[PDB]
Design an enzyme around this catalytic site. Structure first.
Site, PDB file in Angstrom:
ATOM      1  N   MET B  38      43.234  58.236  26.544  1.00 52.83           N
ATOM      2  CA  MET B  38      43.591  58.457  27.943  1.00 52.83           C
ATOM      3  C   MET B  38      42.510  59.249  28.675  1.00 52.83           C
ATOM      4  SD  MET B  38      44.732  60.768  30.345  1.00 52.83           S
ATOM      5  CE  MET B  38      45.744  62.070  29.669  1.00 52.83           C
ATOM      6  N   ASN B  42      40.244  58.180  31.703  1.00 52.42           N
ATOM      7  CA  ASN B  42      40.316  59.014  32.896  1.00 52.42           C
ATOM      8  C   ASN B  42      38.959  59.241  33.549  1.00 52.42           C
ATOM      9  OD1 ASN B  42      41.879  60.636  34.763  1.00 52.42           O
ATOM     10  ND2 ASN B  42      40.869  62.420  33.847  1.00 52.42           N
ATOM     11  N   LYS B  44      36.557  57.211  33.565  1.00 55.75           N
ATOM     12  CA  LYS B  44      35.976  55.923  33.921  1.00 55.75           C
ATOM     13  C   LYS B  44      36.689  55.179  35.056  1.00 55.75           C
ATOM     14  CE  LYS B  44      35.100  53.411  30.301  1.00 55.75           C
ATOM     15  NZ  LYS B  44      35.203  52.838  28.927  1.00 55.75           N
ATOM     16  N   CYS B 142      54.245  50.443  44.867  1.00 54.87           N
ATOM     17  CA  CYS B 142      52.976  50.289  45.579  1.00 54.87           C
ATOM     18  C   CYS B 142      53.061  49.318  46.754  1.00 54.87           C
ATOM     19  CB  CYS B 142      51.847  49.881  44.622  1.00 54.87           C
ATOM     20  SG  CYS B 142      51.429  51.181  43.428  1.00 54.87           S
ATOM     21  N   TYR B 301      40.784  50.480  40.001  1.00 52.23           N
ATOM     22  CA  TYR B 301      39.482  49.913  40.307  1.00 52.23           C
ATOM     23  C   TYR B 301      39.435  48.406  40.025  1.00 52.23           C
ATOM     24  CZ  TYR B 301      34.418  49.492  40.416  1.00 52.23           C
ATOM     25  OH  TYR B 301      33.121  49.150  40.725  1.00 52.23           O
ATOM     26  N   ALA B 302      39.960  48.007  38.873  1.00 54.14           N
ATOM     27  CA  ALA B 302      39.924  46.608  38.443  1.00 54.14           C
ATOM     28  C   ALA B 302      40.749  45.683  39.336  1.00 54.14           C
ATOM     29  CB  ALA B 302      40.372  46.491  36.998  1.00 54.14           C
ATOM     30  N   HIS B 364      56.310  46.332  42.771  1.00 54.94           N
ATOM     31  CA  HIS B 364      57.240  45.932  41.709  1.00 54.94           C
ATOM     32  C   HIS B 364      57.961  44.630  42.025  1.00 54.94           C
ATOM     33  CE1 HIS B 364      56.824  50.314  40.687  1.00 54.94           C
ATOM     34  NE2 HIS B 364      56.577  49.733  39.527  1.00 54.94           N
TER      35      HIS B 364
HETATM   36  C1  LIG Z   1      42.032  51.775  34.088  1.00 55.02           C
HETATM   37  C2  LIG Z   1      40.682  51.256  34.564  1.00 55.02           C
HETATM   38  C3  LIG Z   1      40.173  52.102  35.726  1.00 55.02           C
HETATM   39  C4  LIG Z   1      39.672  51.293  33.428  1.00 55.02           C
HETATM   40  O1  LIG Z   1      38.435  50.866  34.000  1.00 55.02           O
HETATM   41  P1  LIG Z   1      37.284  50.193  33.095  1.00 55.02           P
HETATM   42  O2  LIG Z   1      36.890  51.204  32.044  1.00 55.02           O
HETATM   43  O3  LIG Z   1      36.272  49.582  34.038  1.00 55.02           O
HETATM   44  O4  LIG Z   1      38.139  49.011  32.412  1.00 55.02           O
HETATM   45  P2  LIG Z   1      37.877  48.461  30.920  1.00 55.02           P
HETATM   46  O5  LIG Z   1      38.318  47.019  30.929  1.00 55.02           O
HETATM   47  O6  LIG Z   1      36.495  48.852  30.448  1.00 55.02           O
HETATM   48  O7  LIG Z   1      38.971  49.312  30.106  1.00 55.02           O
HETATM   49  C5  LIG Z   1      38.554  50.437  29.342  1.00 55.02           C
HETATM   50  C6  LIG Z   1      39.706  50.853  28.448  1.00 55.02           C
HETATM   51  O8  LIG Z   1      40.878  51.096  29.227  1.00 55.02           O
HETATM   52  C7  LIG Z   1      41.983  50.416  28.634  1.00 55.02           C
HETATM   53  N1  LIG Z   1      42.981  49.993  29.639  1.00 55.02           N
HETATM   54  C8  LIG Z   1      42.730  49.336  30.786  1.00 55.02           C
HETATM   55  N2  LIG Z   1      43.884  49.102  31.468  1.00 55.02           N
HETATM   56  C9  LIG Z   1      44.893  49.626  30.746  1.00 55.02           C
HETATM   57  C10 LIG Z   1      46.366  49.733  30.881  1.00 55.02           C
HETATM   58  N3  LIG Z   1      47.004  49.219  31.962  1.00 55.02           N
HETATM   59  N4  LIG Z   1      47.054  50.359  29.896  1.00 55.02           N
HETATM   60  C11 LIG Z   1      46.433  50.876  28.819  1.00 55.02           C
HETATM   61  N5  LIG Z   1      45.101  50.814  28.633  1.00 55.02           N
HETATM   62  C12 LIG Z   1      44.292  50.215  29.543  1.00 55.02           C
HETATM   63  C13 LIG Z   1      41.364  49.205  27.962  1.00 55.02           C
HETATM   64  O9  LIG Z   1      42.204  48.714  26.916  1.00 55.02           O
HETATM   65  C14 LIG Z   1      40.054  49.764  27.448  1.00 55.02           C
HETATM   66  O10 LIG Z   1      40.277  50.446  26.226  1.00 55.02           O
HETATM   67  P3  LIG Z   1      39.185  50.394  25.040  1.00 55.02           P
HETATM   68  O11 LIG Z   1      37.991  51.122  25.609  1.00 55.02           O
HETATM   69  O12 LIG Z   1      39.870  51.133  23.917  1.00 55.02           O
HETATM   70  O13 LIG Z   1      38.969  48.914  24.829  1.00 55.02           O
HETATM   71  C15 LIG Z   1      40.781  49.779  34.948  1.00 55.02           C
HETATM   72  O14 LIG Z   1      41.149  49.016  33.782  1.00 55.02           O
HETATM   73  C16 LIG Z   1      41.799  49.502  36.014  1.00 55.02           C
HETATM   74  O15 LIG Z   1      41.572  49.782  37.180  1.00 55.02           O
HETATM   75  N6  LIG Z   1      42.906  48.891  35.589  1.00 55.02           N
HETATM   76  C17 LIG Z   1      44.000  48.495  36.455  1.00 55.02           C
HETATM   77  C18 LIG Z   1      44.997  49.635  36.655  1.00 55.02           C
HETATM   78  C19 LIG Z   1      46.268  49.047  37.211  1.00 55.02           C
HETATM   79  O16 LIG Z   1      46.829  48.133  36.637  1.00 55.02           O
HETATM   80  N7  LIG Z   1      46.718  49.571  38.341  1.00 55.02           N
HETATM   81  C20 LIG Z   1      48.053  49.304  38.829  1.00 55.02           C
HETATM   82  C21 LIG Z   1      48.959  50.517  38.673  1.00 55.02           C
HETATM   83  S1  LIG Z   1      50.579  50.063  39.341  1.00 55.02           S
END
Ligand SMILES: CC(C)(COP(=O)(O)OP(=O)(O)OC[C@H]1O[C@@H](n2cnc3c(N)ncnc32)[C@H](O)[C@@H]1OP(=O)(O)O)[C@@H](O)C(=O)NCCC(=O)NCCS
Ligand SMILES: CC(C)(COP(=O)(O)OP(=O)(O)OC[C@H]1O[C@@H](n2cnc3c(N)ncnc32)[C@H](O)[C@@H]1OP(=O)(O)O)[C@@H](O)C(=O)NCCC(=O)NCCS
EC number: 2.3.1.-
Lengths: 376, 376
Positions: B38, B42, B44, B142, B301-302, B364
Site C-alpha cells: 500500500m 501510495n 506512485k 463518485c 490516475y489510471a 457506484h
Molecule cells: C493506484 C494507481 C495510482 C497505481 O498507479 P500505477 O503505479 O501507475 O499503476 P500500476 O498498474 O503500475 O500498479 C502498481 C501496483 O498497484 C496495484 N494496484 C493498482 N490498482 C489496484 C487496486 N484497485 N487494488 C489493489 N491494487 C492495485 C497493482 O496491482 C500494482 O501492484 P504490483 O506493483 O504489486 O504489481 C493506479 O493503478 C490507479 O489510478 N488505479 C485506479 C484507481 C481506481 O480504480 N480509482 C477509482 C476509485 S473509486
C-alpha cells in the site's frame, strides 16, 4: 398535470403482535423496569397488527448475539429488496405501462445505507432501461413518501417543460425490524424506554406518476392529479426526533413532545401549503381543513389524535389513516402510500370522497412534508 | 435555459502527503506485506497533495482504538458540515444573490448517514428559508456531483414549466479520512491491499444554478448553460465498486478492472448523451469527443489515462482534471465541481476554451453520470 396512475403496497408477511414482541423480549432479557414499561406501552398503541420480514422461528429472534451492521445490510438486501421489487412490480401492473417506459426512479429508505443503493438493484430486478434517471433520497425518515412525491412531481414537470413523456416509479422500502435486536439491547443497557420497539413495522410501497405526455391506451387514467407540494422545516426542533448511526445499525430517539409539536406544525403547514398554491390561495374556504380529504402519516396513535383535533377534523375524516396504523403500524416512508391505496380502493367500491386531498407527514428536521391532490 | 451562476470549493486544510500517511500507518501497525505494498502504491499515485480535516497531531491519528461509527458521525458533523457551510456560503457569494431566494437544495455525500441529514443542518447555518426544497442524494459515491447537477437541472426546468423563479444550491461534502483508521485496520487484518488509503481526500464544494426566471441585477450572469444530463447503468458490473457498511463505518472495495471499464463506459456514455440531445444528435461532428471540452472525475490516475486514450483526447485536453487530481486527489462527489471551478478561473484569466463542455464521472452501479454544458 402530473398524475398518480399506479399504486401498490406490500407489508411483510409475518405478524409481530404484542404476544410476539413480549416473547422476543423475555427470551433475551430478564425483567427490568424499562422492559416492563415498554411491554405495557406496547399493549396500548392501538396497533392490531404489525408485520416483520422475520417469522417467529427466524434466527433473527433467537440468536444470542446482536446483528452486526454488515448483517443488517445483508438482511435488508435479502428481505427488503424483494419486498420493494414486488411492490414496484405491482404498482407498474396497476399502471398498465411497460417497465421500458419508466423514465425516472425516486427511491427512499431510512433502514439501509449502501453503495450502490438499493435503487440500483431494483433497476435490474424490474428490467428498467439502462438510462433510467435514479434518485435515492436519504435523511428524512417518516417524511419520505411525501418527499419522494414532491421530488418526482417537479422532475416530471421538468419533462413537461421539454415536451417529452415522463413516468416516475416512486419506491419506498422500510425494514425497521432488522434493528429490533439492537434497539432491545440498548433499552436494556440504558434503561431508557424506547417506544420505537412498539410502533414500527416492515413494508414496501410504490407509486407510478405520469406527466400525461404521450399517453398510451394501455395506461390507467389519472387517479389523482398532484397540484402542489410544500415542505417546511421548523426552527428549534432538532433534538425532537433522531435516527442515529452506531456500530450495530441505527438507534431511534422519539421525544414525548412529538404529538404536541404535531398539533402546532400541521395546521401551520396546511395554511402555508394553500398560501403557496395560486389556484387556491385567494379564497377563504380553501383555508378550512374540513373542506379537504386528509391523509396523515400515523407516527403514533397520539400523532393522529393531535392532528385530528388541531385541524378541526373527526376520526372518520382520518379513517384510512387510522386503518393503516391499526393494520401495519408506523411503516415510515411507506405509510402514506398505504393510505392512498386504501382511499383509492374505497372510492372504487363506492365511497364518497371530497375533490381535494391533503397529505401530511412529520419527518426528521423536524420537517413537515405536504401535498395537495385533486380529483381529475 | 438552466445555468450555473455560482461556483466554489474548499479542500480540508491539512496536508496528508506520503510521509504523513506512512507516519500514521507505522505508528499503529508493524510491517506486513500488504502494508508495504500500500505504501509503495501510495508514492506512485501521482497525487502531489491530498487534504484531511485532521491535522498531524489530531487524536484521530494517535488514538489506539478505531473510531466507532457514532464517532465517525460526530466527526463528520464537527468537521465536514463547517466545510460544507463555507463552500456553500462562498458559492452563494459568487452568485451574488440572497440566501432567502434559494428555492432548492440538492446535497450529496457518501461519507455520512444521519437523520436528519447534513442538508438539514446546512439550511440553518446558511439561513435558508423555512420552505426550501431539500434533496439529499445517497448511494452514488463518485457519481454524486454530476448526479446532483442532473437532479437540480430537472427540478429547475419544473419551475420554468410553472413560470416561477428557481435557484438551486448544490452542495457536495466528503470526509473520507474519517474512515482511514478503520480502513487501515481492515487492511492489516485481511492483508487485502486497499488503494482507497492512497487516493481519497476531504473537501466540500458547491454550485448555484438558476432557471433564469426573475433575474436580478445582483446576480452573476450564466457561466455555463446546462444543455442535457444522461446517466447510464452498466449490467454485469455490480461488484466492481462498493462502499459497504460495517460496525466502524464504510469499507471501500476498488476493483483493479475500473480503468479498463472506464475506457469502455465513457465513450459509450458520451455517444448516448449526444444521441439523447436533440440539438446535437443530427450532426456527425457532434459525436467526436475532441470537438468538446472535457472534465472527467479522476477516480485515480489510471482512470484519467483510460478515458483520455479511449476518447482520443490529449492530457492537455484534461489539464484541469489532472490538476484537480494532483492537488487534492480523489475527493469523490466534490471533484467535478473543483474542476469546473478550475475551468472557470482559467477562462476568466484569458484561456481559450471550446463552446461545449462534457462532464463525466464513474459512480457506484456501476453508473456513468454525464452532462453537456454550453458557453452562453
Ligand atoms: C493506484 C494507481 C495510482 C497505481 O498507479 P500505477 O503505479 O501507475 O499503476 P500500476 O498498474 O503500475 O500498479 C502498481 C501496483 O498497484 C496495484 N494496484 C493498482 N490498482 C489496484 C487496486 N484497485 N487494488 C489493489 N491494487 C492495485 C497493482 O496491482 C500494482 O501492484 P504490483 O506493483 O504489486 O504489481 C493506479 O493503478 C490507479 O489510478 N488505479 C485506479 C484507481 C481506481 O480504480 N480509482 C477509482 C476509485 S473509486
Ligand atoms: C406511545 C403511545 C401509543 C402511547 O399511547 P397512550 O398509552 O394513549 O399514551 P399515554 O400518554 O397514556 O402514555 C402512556 C405511557 O407511554 C409513555 N410514552 C409516551 N410517549 C413516549 C415516548 N416518546 N417515549 C417514552 N415513553 C413514552 C408515557 O410516558 C406513559 O408512561 P406512564 O404510563 O409511565 O405515564 C402514544 O403516546 C403515541 O402514539 N405517542 C406518539 C409516538 C410518536 O411520537 N411517534 C412518532 C415516531 S417517529
Amino acid at each position: 398535470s402530473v398524475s398518480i396512475v399506479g399504486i401498490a403496497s406490500r407489508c411483510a408477511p409475518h405478524k409481530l403482535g404484542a404476544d410476539e414482541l413480549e416473547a422476543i423480549a423475555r427470551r433475551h432479557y430478564s425483567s427490568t423496569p424499562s422492559l416492563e414499561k415498554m411491554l405495557e406501552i406496547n399493549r396500548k398503541t392501538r396497533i392490531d397488527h404489525r408485520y416483520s420480514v422475520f417469522s417467529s422461528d427466524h434466527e433473527h429472534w433467537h440468536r444470542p448475539t446482536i446483528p452486526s451492521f454488515s448483517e443488517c445490510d445483508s438482511l435488508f438486501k435479502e428481505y427488503g429488496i424483494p419486498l420493494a421489487s414486488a411492490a414496484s412490480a405491482r404498482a407498474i401492473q396497476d399502471w398498465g405501462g411497460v417497465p421500458d417506459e419508466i423514465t425516472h426512479l425516486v427511491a427512499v429508505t431510512c433502514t439501509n445505507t449502501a453503495h450502490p443503493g438499493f435503487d440500483s438493484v431494483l433497476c435490474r430486478k424490474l428490467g428498467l432501461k439502462c438510462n433510467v434517471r435514479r434518485v435515492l433520497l436519504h435523511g428524512i425518515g417518516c417524511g419520505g413518501g411525501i418527499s419522494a412525491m414532491r421530488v418526482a412531481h417537479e422532475l416530471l414537470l421538468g419533462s413537461t417543460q421539454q415536451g417529452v413523456p415522463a413516468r416516475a416509479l416512486i419506491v419506498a422500502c422500510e425494514v425497521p425490524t432488522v434493528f429490533a435486536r439492537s434497539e432491545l439491547d440498548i433499552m436494556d443497557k440504558t434503561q431508557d424506554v424506547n417506544v420505537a420497539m412498539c410502533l414500527f413495522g416492515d413494508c414496501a410501497a410504490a407509486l407510478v406518476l405520469s406527466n400525461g405526455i404521450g399517453h398510451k391506451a394501455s395506461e390507467q387514467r389519472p387517479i389523482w392529479n398532484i397540484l402542489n407540494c410544500e415542505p417546511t422545516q421548523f426552527d428549534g426542533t432538532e433534538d425532537i426526533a433522531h435516527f442515529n448511526v452506531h456500530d450495530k445499525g441505527y438507534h431511534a430517539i422519539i421525544d414525548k413532545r412529538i404529538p404536541q409539536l404535531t398539533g402546532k406544525c400541521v395546521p401551520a403547514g396546511f395554511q402555508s401549503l394553500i398560501s403557496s398554491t395560486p389556484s387556491l390561495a385567494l379564497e377563504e374556504k380553501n383555508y378550512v381543513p374540513s373542506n379537504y380529504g386528509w391523509a396523515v402519516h400515523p407516527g403514533g396513535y397520539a400523532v393522529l389524535v393531535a392532528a385530528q383535533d388541531a385541524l378541526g377534523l373527526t376520526a372518520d375524516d382520518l379513517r384510512a389513516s387510522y386503518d393503516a396504523y391499526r393494520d401495519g403500524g408506523n411503516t415510515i416512508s411507506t405509510t402514506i402510500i398505504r393510505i392512498l391505496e386504501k382511499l383509492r380502493d374505497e372510492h372504487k367500491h363506492g365511497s364518497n370522497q371530497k375533490d381535494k386531498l391533503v397529505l401530511a407527514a412529520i419527518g426528521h428536521g423536524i420537517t413537515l412534508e405536504t401535498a395537495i391532490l385533486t380529483r381529475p
